[PDB]
């Protein structure tokens, strides 16, 4: 039980690190995506493209 708990905690920590880095990269991409996403959302809200 203790060994499994320790291994699980280590896996959670390793995930919290690597997955956090992955999220940073995906956030960097989303930063470029924001402009187009907002433009299309505004176009839909107004209608008539734009």
């Amino acid at each position: 039980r203790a060994q499994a708990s320790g291994e699980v905690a280590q896996t959670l920590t390793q995930a919290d690190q690597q997955l956090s880095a992955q999220g940073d990269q995906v956030r960097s991409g989303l930063e470029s995506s924001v402009d187009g996403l907002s433009a299309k959302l505004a176009s839909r809200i107004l209608g008539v493209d734009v």
Binding site: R1, Q3, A4, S5, E7, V8
Partner: protein
Amino acid sequence: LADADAMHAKALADAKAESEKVTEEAKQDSERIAAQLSEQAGSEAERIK
């Protein structure tokens, strides 16, 4: 008195034999209970994983 002394000797011999048999059975048990608890430990560890 001779028969009673022989009965006591027979009782001691049979007690030794029965104690040996009981110890063997208890060792086999202890082994099986230990195996079952080890399997339970593995199951719990895999559930936590």
